[PDB]
Amino acid sequence: RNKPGKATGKGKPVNNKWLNNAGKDLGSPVPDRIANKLRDKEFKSFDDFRKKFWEEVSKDPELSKQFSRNNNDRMKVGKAPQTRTQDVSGKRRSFELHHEKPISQNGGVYDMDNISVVTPKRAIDIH
Amino acid sequence: MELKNSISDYTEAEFVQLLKEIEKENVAATDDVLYVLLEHFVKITEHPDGTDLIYYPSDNRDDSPEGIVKEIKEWRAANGKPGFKQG
């Protein structure tokens, strides 16, 4: 979809309720332990990045424990976890990765500091 | 598989087979088929929290097919709704 590139950024430390703020404000940030696993690595596109992102989440003991078994299975194959029913919006019922500063202006495609996790509902709201 | 129209058409064992079918599509490349199965799960269980029973189970119960079936049984019974097929 997009163009190849390498991941950069540091992200932020998170508690045991990582996505509790998903959507609200700018959503949840990229965990620092996850950034350390993706940093400097190259990707064919943002979609390939997204798949690698969720896979790393499934391998991080302190993060996967925050998800149900069915959601961990989704992340293990590169898919985003399903959100609670109340946070769904049409065909979009899983967490989405949002760019703070849109690719349009400036950019920041693989910059994990310009990437966050938000719910479908707020993903639309913010826009 | 065969998707029945009502929960009353499903034995408990049969409902578990639907859950594993959903678990299979959960790991599929796309969600196209999964969403169709999830819609059916929501329609027949009639539970207000819908897919949350699958992806956001309560801590007071096991996060497993058996735990799902158990919660559904208790909710429907408490609300006077018809339960799983005794067959």
UniProtKB/Swiss-Prot annotation, chain A:
Annotated segments matching region Disordered: 60-111
Coiled coil: none
TM regions (residue ranges): none
Binding positions (Zn(2+)): H98, A123, H127
Basic and acidic residues bias spans: 89-102
Family in the record: Belongs to the colicin/pyosin nuclease family.
Function: This plasmid-coded bactericidal protein is an endonuclease active on both single- and double-stranded DNA but with undefined specificity.
Protein name: Colicin-E7
Species this chain originates from: Escherichia coli
From Swiss-Prot, chain B:
Disulfide-linked positions: none
GO aspect biological process, one term: bacteriocin immunity
Listed GO MF terms: toxic substance binding
Signal peptide, first to last residue: none
One Pfam entry name: Colicin_Pyocin
Source taxon at top rank: Bacteria
Gene3D superfamilies, sorted: Colicin E immunity protein (1.10.1200.20)
Acyltransferase found in the keyword field: no
Record-linked InterPro entries: Colicin_E_sf (IPR035900), Colicin_pyocin (IPR000290)
Keyword entries, A-Z: Bacteriocin immunity, Plasmid
Keyword Iron applies: no
Protein family membership: Belongs to the colicins ColE2/ColE8/ColE9 and pyocins S1/S2 family.
Functional note: This protein is able to protect a cell, which harbors the plasmid ColE7 encoding colicin E7, against colicin E7, it binds specifically to the DNase-type colicin and inhibits its bactericidal activity. Dimeric ImmE7 may possess a RNase activity that cleaves its own mRNA at a specific site and thus autoregulates translational expression of the downstream ceiE7 gene as well as degradation of the upstream ceaE7 mRNA.
Name of this protein: Colicin-E7 immunity protein
Gene: imm
